[PDB]
Swiss-Prot record:
PANTHER family: BRYOPORIN. This is DELTA-stichotoxin-She4b. A motif (Cell attachment site, crucial for protein stability) lies at residues 141-143. It comes from Stichodactyla helianthus (Sun anemone). The record marks 110-111 as: Important in the initial contact with the lipid membrane. SUPFAM superfamilies: Cytolysin/lectin.
Amino acid sequence: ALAGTIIAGASLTFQVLDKVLEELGKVSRKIAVGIDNESGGTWTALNAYFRSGTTDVILPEFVPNTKALLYSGRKDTGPVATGAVAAFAYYMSSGNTLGVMFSVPFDYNWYSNWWDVKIYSGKRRADQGMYEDLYYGNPYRGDNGWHEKNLGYGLRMKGIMTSAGEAKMQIKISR
């Protein structure tokens, strides 16, 4: 499998993430995630809090510098109008937590995809509160556009998320 695995940070592309989407099988709402670590340190998985949907793989436990982690999620199968929404966190070698959120809703008649990345002081597990902190703060939109910002702690992030039902999200965390 590709999801739940790590690869050379330089080989992370949309082609790889699209293949991650294929791997998820045929479900109307899913997301492929690739996060390139260039923070000058290793990361260790904490957990993932899925508010909507689920995942079939486990968070790559270790992500060394120059490496990209691959992950994925999707809506529950069946006649349920739900999407793929979650927040997951990785513990950094600097002692802080990297928090990531993705929201892929079922109803684009009224909603859009949104995502965000944030660094939290210390060891912080992903939960409803972290989810609300990323989604209700100032999240980027899945607009097929690249965005970037400083995350404090001398680190920055540049990334992108697509706008439809089978979403791809690529992020790079640099120092």
